C-alpha cells in the first residue's frame, strides 16, 4: 500500500493536491453537512 495518510501530509493539509475535484466535492458536502438539515436556527429562507 502507498499513501501514508499520517506523518507526511501533515505539513499543512491532506492530499487534496490529487483529489482536487473529489476533494472539493467531498469536502464541499462536508461543510454542507456539518449538521443535519443545514441548521434552521435563523436562516430558513
Amino acid at each position: 500500500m502507498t499513501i501514508s495518510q499520517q506523518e507526511f501530509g501533515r505539513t499543512g493539509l491532506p492530499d487534496l493536491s490529487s483529489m482536487t475535484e473529489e476533494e472539493q466535492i467531498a469536502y464541499a458536502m462536508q461543510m454542507s453537512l456539518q449538521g443535519a438539515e443545514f441548521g434552521q436556527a435563523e436562516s430558513a429562507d
Side-chain angles (χ1 to χ4, degrees):
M1 65 183 199
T2 74
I3 169 60
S4 238
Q5 201 177 43
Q6 299 259 24
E7 51 179 314
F8 220 95
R10 191 60 228 278
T11 180
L13 249 80
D15 313 323
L16 154 160
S17 337
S18 13
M19 268 43 50
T20 154
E21 33 135 337
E22 70 237 85
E23 241 34 21
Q24 292 140 23
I25 71 80
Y27 298 0
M29 69 75 224
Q30 197 146 350
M31 83 206 270
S32 293
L33 218 61
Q34 86 220 265
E37 349 169 35
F38 229 150
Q40 39 80 20
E42 260 107 344
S43 16
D45 193 307

PDB file of all heavy atoms in Angstrom:
ATOM      1  N   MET A   1       0.840  -1.227   0.000  1.00  0.00           N
ATOM      2  CA  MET A   1       0.000   0.000   0.000  1.00  0.00           C
ATOM      3  C   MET A   1       0.862   1.258   0.000  1.00  0.00           C
ATOM      4  O   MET A   1       1.933   1.290   0.607  1.00  0.00           O
ATOM      5  CB  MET A   1      -0.897  -0.024   1.239  1.00  0.00           C
ATOM      6  CG  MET A   1      -0.130   0.059   2.547  1.00  0.00           C
ATOM      7  SD  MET A   1      -1.203  -0.058   3.992  1.00  0.00           S
ATOM      8  CE  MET A   1      -0.143   0.636   5.258  1.00  0.00           C
ATOM      9  N   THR A   2       0.389   2.294  -0.685  1.00  0.00           N
ATOM     10  CA  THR A   2       1.119   3.555  -0.763  1.00  0.00           C
ATOM     11  C   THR A   2       0.172   4.744  -0.623  1.00  0.00           C
ATOM     12  O   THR A   2      -0.776   4.891  -1.393  1.00  0.00           O
ATOM     13  CB  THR A   2       1.878   3.647  -2.089  1.00  0.00           C
ATOM     14  OG1 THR A   2       0.986   3.896  -3.161  1.00  0.00           O
ATOM     15  CG2 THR A   2       2.656   2.392  -2.419  1.00  0.00           C
ATOM     16  N   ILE A   3       0.439   5.590   0.367  1.00  0.00           N
ATOM     17  CA  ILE A   3      -0.386   6.767   0.610  1.00  0.00           C
ATOM     18  C   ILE A   3       0.051   7.491   1.880  1.00  0.00           C
ATOM     19  O   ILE A   3      -0.015   8.718   1.960  1.00  0.00           O
ATOM     20  CB  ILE A   3      -1.876   6.394   0.734  1.00  0.00           C
ATOM     21  CG1 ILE A   3      -2.685   7.590   1.243  1.00  0.00           C
ATOM     22  CG2 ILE A   3      -2.050   5.198   1.659  1.00  0.00           C
ATOM     23  CD1 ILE A   3      -2.609   8.800   0.339  1.00  0.00           C
ATOM     24  N   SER A   4       0.495   6.724   2.870  1.00  0.00           N
ATOM     25  CA  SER A   4       0.941   7.293   4.137  1.00  0.00           C
ATOM     26  C   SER A   4      -0.251   7.650   5.018  1.00  0.00           C
ATOM     27  O   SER A   4      -0.552   6.951   5.985  1.00  0.00           O
ATOM     28  CB  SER A   4       1.799   8.536   3.890  1.00  0.00           C
ATOM     29  OG  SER A   4       3.091   8.384   4.454  1.00  0.00           O
ATOM     30  N   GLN A   5      -0.928   8.743   4.675  1.00  0.00           N
ATOM     31  CA  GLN A   5      -2.091   9.193   5.431  1.00  0.00           C
ATOM     32  C   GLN A   5      -1.675  10.060   6.614  1.00  0.00           C
ATOM     33  O   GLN A   5      -2.253  11.120   6.851  1.00  0.00           O
ATOM     34  CB  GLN A   5      -2.901   7.992   5.927  1.00  0.00           C
ATOM     35  CG  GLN A   5      -4.344   8.330   6.264  1.00  0.00           C
ATOM     36  CD  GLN A   5      -5.143   7.113   6.686  1.00  0.00           C
ATOM     37  OE1 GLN A   5      -4.668   6.280   7.458  1.00  0.00           O
ATOM     38  NE2 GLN A   5      -6.368   7.004   6.182  1.00  0.00           N
ATOM     39  N   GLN A   6      -0.672   9.602   7.357  1.00  0.00           N
ATOM     40  CA  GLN A   6      -0.186  10.339   8.517  1.00  0.00           C
ATOM     41  C   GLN A   6       1.326  10.530   8.455  1.00  0.00           C
ATOM     42  O   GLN A   6       1.999   9.968   7.591  1.00  0.00           O
ATOM     43  CB  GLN A   6      -0.564   9.606   9.806  1.00  0.00           C
ATOM     44  CG  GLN A   6      -2.064   9.457  10.002  1.00  0.00           C
ATOM     45  CD  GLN A   6      -2.627  10.467  10.983  1.00  0.00           C
ATOM     46  OE1 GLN A   6      -2.048  11.533  11.193  1.00  0.00           O
ATOM     47  NE2 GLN A   6      -3.761  10.136  11.589  1.00  0.00           N
ATOM     48  N   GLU A   7       1.852  11.330   9.378  1.00  0.00           N
ATOM     49  CA  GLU A   7       3.284  11.599   9.434  1.00  0.00           C
ATOM     50  C   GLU A   7       3.862  11.780   8.033  1.00  0.00           C
ATOM     51  O   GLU A   7       4.713  11.006   7.598  1.00  0.00           O
ATOM     52  CB  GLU A   7       4.010  10.462  10.154  1.00  0.00           C
ATOM     53  CG  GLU A   7       3.676   9.083   9.609  1.00  0.00           C
ATOM     54  CD  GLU A   7       4.430   7.977  10.320  1.00  0.00           C
ATOM     55  OE1 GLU A   7       5.655   8.126  10.515  1.00  0.00           O
ATOM     56  OE2 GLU A   7       3.797   6.964  10.683  1.00  0.00           O
ATOM     57  N   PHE A   8       3.397  12.811   7.335  1.00  0.00           N
ATOM     58  CA  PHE A   8       3.874  13.095   5.986  1.00  0.00           C
ATOM     59  C   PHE A   8       3.076  14.231   5.358  1.00  0.00           C
ATOM     60  O   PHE A   8       3.613  15.306   5.089  1.00  0.00           O
ATOM     61  CB  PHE A   8       3.778  11.843   5.111  1.00  0.00           C
ATOM     62  CG  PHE A   8       4.959  11.660   4.201  1.00  0.00           C
ATOM     63  CD1 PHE A   8       6.028  10.863   4.582  1.00  0.00           C
ATOM     64  CD2 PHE A   8       5.001  12.286   2.966  1.00  0.00           C
ATOM     65  CE1 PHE A   8       7.115  10.695   3.746  1.00  0.00           C
ATOM     66  CE2 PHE A   8       6.087  12.121   2.126  1.00  0.00           C
ATOM     67  CZ  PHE A   8       7.146  11.324   2.518  1.00  0.00           C
ATOM     68  N   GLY A   9       1.789  13.990   5.131  1.00  0.00           N
ATOM     69  CA  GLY A   9       0.938  15.006   4.541  1.00  0.00           C
ATOM     70  C   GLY A   9       0.329  15.920   5.585  1.00  0.00           C
ATOM     71  O   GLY A   9      -0.726  16.514   5.362  1.00  0.00           O
ATOM     72  N   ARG A  10       0.997  16.032   6.729  1.00  0.00           N
ATOM     73  CA  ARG A  10       0.519  16.878   7.815  1.00  0.00           C
ATOM     74  C   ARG A  10       1.149  18.266   7.747  1.00  0.00           C
ATOM     75  O   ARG A  10       0.815  19.149   8.537  1.00  0.00           O
ATOM     76  CB  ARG A  10       0.828  16.231   9.167  1.00  0.00           C
ATOM     77  CG  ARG A  10       0.137  16.912  10.337  1.00  0.00           C
ATOM     78  CD  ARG A  10      -1.376  16.886  10.184  1.00  0.00           C
ATOM     79  NE  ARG A  10      -1.974  18.195  10.425  1.00  0.00           N
ATOM     80  CZ  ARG A  10      -2.247  18.669  11.636  1.00  0.00           C
ATOM     81  NH1 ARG A  10      -1.976  17.942  12.712  1.00  0.00           N
ATOM     82  NH2 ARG A  10      -2.791  19.870  11.773  1.00  0.00           N
ATOM     83  N   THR A  11       2.063  18.452   6.800  1.00  0.00           N
ATOM     84  CA  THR A  11       2.740  19.732   6.632  1.00  0.00           C
ATOM     85  C   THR A  11       1.751  20.890   6.706  1.00  0.00           C
ATOM     86  O   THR A  11       2.053  21.939   7.274  1.00  0.00           O
ATOM     87  CB  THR A  11       3.485  19.766   5.296  1.00  0.00           C
ATOM     88  OG1 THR A  11       4.143  21.008   5.120  1.00  0.00           O
ATOM     89  CG2 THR A  11       2.580  19.552   4.102  1.00  0.00           C
ATOM     90  N   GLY A  12       0.570  20.697   6.127  1.00  0.00           N
ATOM     91  CA  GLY A  12      -0.437  21.742   6.141  1.00  0.00           C
ATOM     92  C   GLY A  12      -1.846  21.208   5.971  1.00  0.00           C
ATOM     93  O   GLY A  12      -2.764  21.633   6.672  1.00  0.00           O
ATOM     94  N   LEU A  13      -2.024  20.280   5.036  1.00  0.00           N
ATOM     95  CA  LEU A  13      -3.338  19.700   4.781  1.00  0.00           C
ATOM     96  C   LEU A  13      -3.218  18.322   4.138  1.00  0.00           C
ATOM     97  O   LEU A  13      -2.118  17.858   3.835  1.00  0.00           O
ATOM     98  CB  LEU A  13      -4.159  20.625   3.880  1.00  0.00           C
ATOM     99  CG  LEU A  13      -5.354  21.297   4.556  1.00  0.00           C
ATOM    100  CD1 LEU A  13      -4.902  22.503   5.363  1.00  0.00           C
ATOM    101  CD2 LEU A  13      -6.391  21.705   3.520  1.00  0.00           C
ATOM    102  N   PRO A  14      -4.359  17.650   3.925  1.00  0.00           N
ATOM    103  CA  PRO A  14      -4.396  16.315   3.317  1.00  0.00           C
ATOM    104  C   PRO A  14      -3.717  16.278   1.953  1.00  0.00           C
ATOM    105  O   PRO A  14      -2.816  17.068   1.674  1.00  0.00           O
ATOM    106  CB  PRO A  14      -5.893  16.025   3.173  1.00  0.00           C
ATOM    107  CG  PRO A  14      -6.554  16.905   4.178  1.00  0.00           C
ATOM    108  CD  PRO A  14      -5.705  18.142   4.265  1.00  0.00           C
ATOM    109  N   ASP A  15      -4.156  15.351   1.106  1.00  0.00           N
ATOM    110  CA  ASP A  15      -3.592  15.205  -0.230  1.00  0.00           C
ATOM    111  C   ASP A  15      -4.554  15.729  -1.292  1.00  0.00           C
ATOM    112  O   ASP A  15      -4.734  15.111  -2.340  1.00  0.00           O
ATOM    113  CB  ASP A  15      -3.259  13.738  -0.503  1.00  0.00           C
ATOM    114  CG  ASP A  15      -2.513  13.091   0.646  1.00  0.00           C
ATOM    115  OD1 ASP A  15      -1.669  13.773   1.266  1.00  0.00           O
ATOM    116  OD2 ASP A  15      -2.770  11.902   0.929  1.00  0.00           O
ATOM    117  N   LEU A  16      -5.165  16.875  -1.013  1.00  0.00           N
ATOM    118  CA  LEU A  16      -6.107  17.491  -1.940  1.00  0.00           C
ATOM    119  C   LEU A  16      -5.415  17.881  -3.241  1.00  0.00           C
ATOM    120  O   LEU A  16      -6.068  18.239  -4.220  1.00  0.00           O
ATOM    121  CB  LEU A  16      -6.750  18.724  -1.300  1.00  0.00           C
ATOM    122  CG  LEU A  16      -7.234  19.788  -2.287  1.00  0.00           C
ATOM    123  CD1 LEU A  16      -8.256  20.699  -1.625  1.00  0.00           C
ATOM    124  CD2 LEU A  16      -6.060  20.597  -2.815  1.00  0.00           C
ATOM    125  N   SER A  17      -4.089  17.808  -3.249  1.00  0.00           N
ATOM    126  CA  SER A  17      -3.316  18.148  -4.436  1.00  0.00           C
ATOM    127  C   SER A  17      -3.518  17.100  -5.528  1.00  0.00           C
ATOM    128  O   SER A  17      -3.032  17.258  -6.649  1.00  0.00           O
ATOM    129  CB  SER A  17      -1.831  18.264  -4.089  1.00  0.00           C
ATOM    130  OG  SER A  17      -1.648  18.544  -2.711  1.00  0.00           O
ATOM    131  N   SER A  18      -4.239  16.030  -5.196  1.00  0.00           N
ATOM    132  CA  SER A  18      -4.504  14.960  -6.150  1.00  0.00           C
ATOM    133  C   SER A  18      -6.001  14.680  -6.263  1.00  0.00           C
ATOM    134  O   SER A  18      -6.497  14.349  -7.339  1.00  0.00           O
ATOM    135  CB  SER A  18      -3.761  13.686  -5.741  1.00  0.00           C
ATOM    136  OG  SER A  18      -3.268  13.786  -4.416  1.00  0.00           O
ATOM    137  N   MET A  19      -6.721  14.819  -5.150  1.00  0.00           N
ATOM    138  CA  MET A  19      -8.164  14.585  -5.144  1.00  0.00           C
ATOM    139  C   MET A  19      -8.894  15.785  -5.726  1.00  0.00           C
ATOM    140  O   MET A  19      -9.972  15.663  -6.300  1.00  0.00           O
ATOM    141  CB  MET A  19      -8.656  14.321  -3.726  1.00  0.00           C
ATOM    142  CG  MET A  19      -8.687  12.851  -3.360  1.00  0.00           C
ATOM    143  SD  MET A  19      -7.213  11.968  -3.902  1.00  0.00           S
ATOM    144  CE  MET A  19      -5.929  13.035  -3.255  1.00  0.00           C
ATOM    145  N   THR A  20      -8.271  16.940  -5.567  1.00  0.00           N
ATOM    146  CA  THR A  20      -8.801  18.208  -6.069  1.00  0.00           C
ATOM    147  C   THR A  20     -10.319  18.189  -6.232  1.00  0.00           C
ATOM    148  O   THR A  20     -11.051  18.643  -5.356  1.00  0.00           O
ATOM    149  CB  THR A  20      -8.150  18.545  -7.409  1.00  0.00           C
ATOM    150  OG1 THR A  20      -9.000  19.367  -8.189  1.00  0.00           O
ATOM    151  CG2 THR A  20      -7.810  17.321  -8.233  1.00  0.00           C
ATOM    152  N   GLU A  21     -10.777  17.686  -7.375  1.00  0.00           N
ATOM    153  CA  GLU A  21     -12.202  17.626  -7.682  1.00  0.00           C
ATOM    154  C   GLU A  21     -12.975  16.841  -6.630  1.00  0.00           C
ATOM    155  O   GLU A  21     -13.894  17.367  -6.008  1.00  0.00           O
ATOM    156  CB  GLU A  21     -12.417  16.998  -9.060  1.00  0.00           C
ATOM    157  CG  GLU A  21     -11.393  15.929  -9.406  1.00  0.00           C
ATOM    158  CD  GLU A  21     -12.027  14.686  -9.999  1.00  0.00           C
ATOM    159  OE1 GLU A  21     -13.230  14.457  -9.755  1.00  0.00           O
ATOM    160  OE2 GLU A  21     -11.319  13.940 -10.709  1.00  0.00           O
ATOM    161  N   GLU A  22     -12.609  15.578  -6.447  1.00  0.00           N
ATOM    162  CA  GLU A  22     -13.285  14.722  -5.476  1.00  0.00           C
ATOM    163  C   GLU A  22     -13.064  15.218  -4.050  1.00  0.00           C
ATOM    164  O   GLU A  22     -13.855  14.927  -3.152  1.00  0.00           O
ATOM    165  CB  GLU A  22     -12.799  13.277  -5.608  1.00  0.00           C
ATOM    166  CG  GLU A  22     -11.366  13.073  -5.147  1.00  0.00           C
ATOM    167  CD  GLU A  22     -10.485  12.485  -6.231  1.00  0.00           C
ATOM    168  OE1 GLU A  22      -9.958  13.263  -7.055  1.00  0.00           O
ATOM    169  OE2 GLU A  22     -10.320  11.247  -6.256  1.00  0.00           O
ATOM    170  N   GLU A  23     -11.988  15.970  -3.843  1.00  0.00           N
ATOM    171  CA  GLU A  23     -11.676  16.506  -2.521  1.00  0.00           C
ATOM    172  C   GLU A  23     -12.448  17.797  -2.270  1.00  0.00           C
ATOM    173  O   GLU A  23     -12.669  18.188  -1.124  1.00  0.00           O
ATOM    174  CB  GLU A  23     -10.173  16.763  -2.386  1.00  0.00           C
ATOM    175  CG  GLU A  23      -9.504  15.965  -1.275  1.00  0.00           C
ATOM    176  CD  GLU A  23     -10.116  14.588  -1.073  1.00  0.00           C
ATOM    177  OE1 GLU A  23     -10.777  14.086  -2.005  1.00  0.00           O
ATOM    178  OE2 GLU A  23      -9.932  14.015   0.021  1.00  0.00           O
ATOM    179  N   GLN A  24     -12.868  18.447  -3.349  1.00  0.00           N
ATOM    180  CA  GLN A  24     -13.628  19.685  -3.250  1.00  0.00           C
ATOM    181  C   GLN A  24     -15.117  19.376  -3.252  1.00  0.00           C
ATOM    182  O   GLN A  24     -15.929  20.152  -2.752  1.00  0.00           O
ATOM    183  CB  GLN A  24     -13.282  20.621  -4.411  1.00  0.00           C
ATOM    184  CG  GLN A  24     -11.863  21.162  -4.353  1.00  0.00           C
ATOM    185  CD  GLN A  24     -11.201  21.204  -5.717  1.00  0.00           C
ATOM    186  OE1 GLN A  24     -11.875  21.246  -6.746  1.00  0.00           O
ATOM    187  NE2 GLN A  24      -9.873  21.191  -5.731  1.00  0.00           N
ATOM    188  N   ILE A  25     -15.454  18.217  -3.801  1.00  0.00           N
ATOM    189  CA  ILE A  25     -16.828  17.757  -3.862  1.00  0.00           C
ATOM    190  C   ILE A  25     -17.153  17.004  -2.588  1.00  0.00           C
ATOM    191  O   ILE A  25     -18.262  17.073  -2.057  1.00  0.00           O
ATOM    192  CB  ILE A  25     -17.039  16.828  -5.066  1.00  0.00           C
ATOM    193  CG1 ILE A  25     -16.343  15.492  -4.832  1.00  0.00           C
ATOM    194  CG2 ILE A  25     -16.529  17.482  -6.341  1.00  0.00           C
ATOM    195  CD1 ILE A  25     -17.126  14.545  -3.948  1.00  0.00           C
ATOM    196  N   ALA A  26     -16.141  16.308  -2.098  1.00  0.00           N
ATOM    197  CA  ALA A  26     -16.235  15.547  -0.872  1.00  0.00           C
ATOM    198  C   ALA A  26     -16.186  16.498   0.306  1.00  0.00           C
ATOM    199  O   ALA A  26     -16.954  16.385   1.251  1.00  0.00           O
ATOM    200  CB  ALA A  26     -15.101  14.535  -0.797  1.00  0.00           C
ATOM    201  N   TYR A  27     -15.294  17.469   0.231  1.00  0.00           N
ATOM    202  CA  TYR A  27     -15.193  18.450   1.293  1.00  0.00           C
ATOM    203  C   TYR A  27     -16.345  19.434   1.173  1.00  0.00           C
ATOM    204  O   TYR A  27     -16.816  19.983   2.169  1.00  0.00           O
ATOM    205  CB  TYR A  27     -13.857  19.175   1.242  1.00  0.00           C
ATOM    206  CG  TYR A  27     -12.668  18.263   1.441  1.00  0.00           C
ATOM    207  CD1 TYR A  27     -12.842  16.901   1.654  1.00  0.00           C
ATOM    208  CD2 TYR A  27     -11.372  18.764   1.418  1.00  0.00           C
ATOM    209  CE1 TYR A  27     -11.758  16.064   1.837  1.00  0.00           C
ATOM    210  CE2 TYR A  27     -10.283  17.933   1.601  1.00  0.00           C
ATOM    211  CZ  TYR A  27     -10.481  16.585   1.811  1.00  0.00           C
ATOM    212  OH  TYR A  27      -9.400  15.754   1.994  1.00  0.00           O
ATOM    213  N   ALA A  28     -16.816  19.629  -0.058  1.00  0.00           N
ATOM    214  CA  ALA A  28     -17.936  20.519  -0.305  1.00  0.00           C
ATOM    215  C   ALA A  28     -19.150  20.031   0.465  1.00  0.00           C
ATOM    216  O   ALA A  28     -19.799  20.803   1.173  1.00  0.00           O
ATOM    217  CB  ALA A  28     -18.247  20.601  -1.792  1.00  0.00           C
ATOM    218  N   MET A  29     -19.441  18.735   0.351  1.00  0.00           N
ATOM    219  CA  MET A  29     -20.569  18.168   1.077  1.00  0.00           C
ATOM    220  C   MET A  29     -20.265  18.189   2.569  1.00  0.00           C
ATOM    221  O   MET A  29     -21.168  18.294   3.398  1.00  0.00           O
ATOM    222  CB  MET A  29     -20.891  16.744   0.604  1.00  0.00           C
ATOM    223  CG  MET A  29     -19.846  15.708   0.978  1.00  0.00           C
ATOM    224  SD  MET A  29     -19.902  15.242   2.723  1.00  0.00           S
ATOM    225  CE  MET A  29     -18.159  15.258   3.140  1.00  0.00           C
ATOM    226  N   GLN A  30     -18.975  18.110   2.901  1.00  0.00           N
ATOM    227  CA  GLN A  30     -18.542  18.144   4.294  1.00  0.00           C
ATOM    228  C   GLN A  30     -19.141  19.348   5.013  1.00  0.00           C
ATOM    229  O   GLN A  30     -19.859  19.202   6.001  1.00  0.00           O
ATOM    230  CB  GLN A  30     -17.014  18.209   4.379  1.00  0.00           C
ATOM    231  CG  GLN A  30     -16.467  17.836   5.746  1.00  0.00           C
ATOM    232  CD  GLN A  30     -15.128  17.129   5.666  1.00  0.00           C
ATOM    233  OE1 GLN A  30     -14.676  16.753   4.585  1.00  0.00           O
ATOM    234  NE2 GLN A  30     -14.487  16.943   6.814  1.00  0.00           N
ATOM    235  N   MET A  31     -18.837  20.540   4.506  1.00  0.00           N
ATOM    236  CA  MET A  31     -19.342  21.774   5.095  1.00  0.00           C
ATOM    237  C   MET A  31     -20.849  21.889   4.906  1.00  0.00           C
ATOM    238  O   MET A  31     -21.547  22.474   5.735  1.00  0.00           O
ATOM    239  CB  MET A  31     -18.643  22.985   4.473  1.00  0.00           C
ATOM    240  CG  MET A  31     -19.247  23.421   3.147  1.00  0.00           C
ATOM    241  SD  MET A  31     -18.060  24.275   2.090  1.00  0.00           S
ATOM    242  CE  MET A  31     -18.299  25.971   2.613  1.00  0.00           C
ATOM    243  N   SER A  32     -21.347  21.327   3.810  1.00  0.00           N
ATOM    244  CA  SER A  32     -22.774  21.367   3.512  1.00  0.00           C
ATOM    245  C   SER A  32     -23.544  20.391   4.398  1.00  0.00           C
ATOM    246  O   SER A  32     -24.774  20.402   4.427  1.00  0.00           O
ATOM    247  CB  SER A  32     -23.020  21.039   2.039  1.00  0.00           C
ATOM    248  OG  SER A  32     -22.512  22.060   1.198  1.00  0.00           O
ATOM    249  N   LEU A  33     -22.811  19.548   5.119  1.00  0.00           N
ATOM    250  CA  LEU A  33     -23.424  18.566   6.005  1.00  0.00           C
ATOM    251  C   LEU A  33     -22.740  18.565   7.368  1.00  0.00           C
ATOM    252  O   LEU A  33     -22.472  17.508   7.940  1.00  0.00           O
ATOM    253  CB  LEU A  33     -23.350  17.170   5.383  1.00  0.00           C
ATOM    254  CG  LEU A  33     -24.584  16.294   5.607  1.00  0.00           C
ATOM    255  CD1 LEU A  33     -25.815  16.938   4.987  1.00  0.00           C
ATOM    256  CD2 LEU A  33     -24.362  14.903   5.031  1.00  0.00           C
ATOM    257  N   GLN A  34     -22.462  19.759   7.884  1.00  0.00           N
ATOM    258  CA  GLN A  34     -21.808  19.899   9.180  1.00  0.00           C
ATOM    259  C   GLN A  34     -22.828  19.854  10.314  1.00  0.00           C
ATOM    260  O   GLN A  34     -22.499  20.122  11.469  1.00  0.00           O
ATOM    261  CB  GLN A  34     -21.020  21.211   9.238  1.00  0.00           C
ATOM    262  CG  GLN A  34     -21.859  22.406   9.660  1.00  0.00           C
ATOM    263  CD  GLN A  34     -21.534  23.656   8.867  1.00  0.00           C
ATOM    264  OE1 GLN A  34     -20.729  24.484   9.293  1.00  0.00           O
ATOM    265  NE2 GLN A  34     -22.162  23.801   7.705  1.00  0.00           N
ATOM    266  N   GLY A  35     -24.068  19.514   9.977  1.00  0.00           N
ATOM    267  CA  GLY A  35     -25.115  19.442  10.978  1.00  0.00           C
ATOM    268  C   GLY A  35     -26.091  18.311  10.718  1.00  0.00           C
ATOM    269  O   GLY A  35     -25.972  17.233  11.300  1.00  0.00           O
ATOM    270  N   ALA A  36     -27.059  18.556   9.842  1.00  0.00           N
ATOM    271  CA  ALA A  36     -28.059  17.551   9.507  1.00  0.00           C
ATOM    272  C   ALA A  36     -29.041  18.077   8.465  1.00  0.00           C
ATOM    273  O   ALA A  36     -29.252  17.453   7.425  1.00  0.00           O
ATOM    274  CB  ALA A  36     -28.802  17.109  10.758  1.00  0.00           C
ATOM    275  N   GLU A  37     -29.640  19.229   8.751  1.00  0.00           N
ATOM    276  CA  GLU A  37     -30.600  19.840   7.838  1.00  0.00           C
ATOM    277  C   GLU A  37     -30.181  21.262   7.480  1.00  0.00           C
ATOM    278  O   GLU A  37     -31.023  22.113   7.193  1.00  0.00           O
ATOM    279  CB  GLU A  37     -31.998  19.850   8.462  1.00  0.00           C
ATOM    280  CG  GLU A  37     -32.112  19.002   9.718  1.00  0.00           C
ATOM    281  CD  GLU A  37     -33.414  19.235  10.462  1.00  0.00           C
ATOM    282  OE1 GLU A  37     -34.444  19.463   9.794  1.00  0.00           O
ATOM    283  OE2 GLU A  37     -33.401  19.189  11.709  1.00  0.00           O
ATOM    284  N   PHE A  38     -28.876  21.511   7.497  1.00  0.00           N
ATOM    285  CA  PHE A  38     -28.345  22.830   7.174  1.00  0.00           C
ATOM    286  C   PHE A  38     -28.642  23.828   8.291  1.00  0.00           C
ATOM    287  O   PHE A  38     -28.427  25.030   8.136  1.00  0.00           O
ATOM    288  CB  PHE A  38     -28.937  23.333   5.856  1.00  0.00           C
ATOM    289  CG  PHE A  38     -27.905  23.841   4.890  1.00  0.00           C
ATOM    290  CD1 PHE A  38     -28.117  23.759   3.523  1.00  0.00           C
ATOM    291  CD2 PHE A  38     -26.724  24.404   5.349  1.00  0.00           C
ATOM    292  CE1 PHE A  38     -27.170  24.228   2.632  1.00  0.00           C
ATOM    293  CE2 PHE A  38     -25.775  24.874   4.463  1.00  0.00           C
ATOM    294  CZ  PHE A  38     -25.997  24.785   3.102  1.00  0.00           C
ATOM    295  N   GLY A  39     -29.139  23.321   9.416  1.00  0.00           N
ATOM    296  CA  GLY A  39     -29.456  24.181  10.540  1.00  0.00           C
ATOM    297  C   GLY A  39     -30.457  25.261  10.181  1.00  0.00           C
ATOM    298  O   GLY A  39     -30.249  26.016   9.231  1.00  0.00           O
ATOM    299  N   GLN A  40     -31.543  25.336  10.942  1.00  0.00           N
ATOM    300  CA  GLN A  40     -32.579  26.333  10.699  1.00  0.00           C
ATOM    301  C   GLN A  40     -32.780  27.220  11.925  1.00  0.00           C
ATOM    302  O   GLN A  40     -33.903  27.608  12.244  1.00  0.00           O
ATOM    303  CB  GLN A  40     -33.897  25.651  10.328  1.00  0.00           C
ATOM    304  CG  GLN A  40     -34.174  24.388  11.127  1.00  0.00           C
ATOM    305  CD  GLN A  40     -34.729  24.681  12.507  1.00  0.00           C
ATOM    306  OE1 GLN A  40     -35.252  25.767  12.760  1.00  0.00           O
ATOM    307  NE2 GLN A  40     -34.619  23.712  13.408  1.00  0.00           N
ATOM    308  N   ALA A  41     -31.684  27.535  12.607  1.00  0.00           N
ATOM    309  CA  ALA A  41     -31.741  28.375  13.797  1.00  0.00           C
ATOM    310  C   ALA A  41     -32.266  29.767  13.461  1.00  0.00           C
ATOM    311  O   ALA A  41     -33.128  30.301  14.158  1.00  0.00           O
ATOM    312  CB  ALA A  41     -30.367  28.469  14.442  1.00  0.00           C
ATOM    313  N   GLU A  42     -31.739  30.348  12.388  1.00  0.00           N
ATOM    314  CA  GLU A  42     -32.155  31.678  11.958  1.00  0.00           C
ATOM    315  C   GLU A  42     -31.757  31.929  10.507  1.00  0.00           C
ATOM    316  O   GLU A  42     -31.235  32.993  10.171  1.00  0.00           O
ATOM    317  CB  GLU A  42     -31.537  32.746  12.861  1.00  0.00           C
ATOM    318  CG  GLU A  42     -32.494  33.277  13.916  1.00  0.00           C
ATOM    319  CD  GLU A  42     -32.166  32.770  15.307  1.00  0.00           C
ATOM    320  OE1 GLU A  42     -31.406  31.785  15.416  1.00  0.00           O
ATOM    321  OE2 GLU A  42     -32.669  33.359  16.287  1.00  0.00           O
ATOM    322  N   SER A  43     -32.005  30.944   9.650  1.00  0.00           N
ATOM    323  CA  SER A  43     -31.672  31.057   8.235  1.00  0.00           C
ATOM    324  C   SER A  43     -32.602  30.193   7.388  1.00  0.00           C
ATOM    325  O   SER A  43     -32.153  29.477   6.493  1.00  0.00           O
ATOM    326  CB  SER A  43     -30.218  30.648   7.998  1.00  0.00           C
ATOM    327  OG  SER A  43     -29.701  29.936   9.108  1.00  0.00           O
ATOM    328  N   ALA A  44     -33.896  30.266   7.678  1.00  0.00           N
ATOM    329  CA  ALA A  44     -34.889  29.491   6.944  1.00  0.00           C
ATOM    330  C   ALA A  44     -35.569  30.339   5.875  1.00  0.00           C
ATOM    331  O   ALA A  44     -36.667  30.856   6.084  1.00  0.00           O
ATOM    332  CB  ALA A  44     -35.922  28.917   7.902  1.00  0.00           C
ATOM    333  N   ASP A  45     -34.912  30.477   4.729  1.00  0.00           N
ATOM    334  CA  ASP A  45     -35.456  31.262   3.626  1.00  0.00           C
ATOM    335  C   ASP A  45     -35.441  30.463   2.328  1.00  0.00           C
ATOM    336  O   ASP A  45     -34.427  30.532   1.601  1.00  0.00           O
ATOM    337  CB  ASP A  45     -34.657  32.555   3.451  1.00  0.00           C
ATOM    338  CG  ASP A  45     -35.356  33.549   2.544  1.00  0.00           C
ATOM    339  OD1 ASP A  45     -35.725  33.162   1.415  1.00  0.00           O
ATOM    340  OD2 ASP A  45     -35.532  34.712   2.961  1.00  0.00           O
TER     341      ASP A  45
END
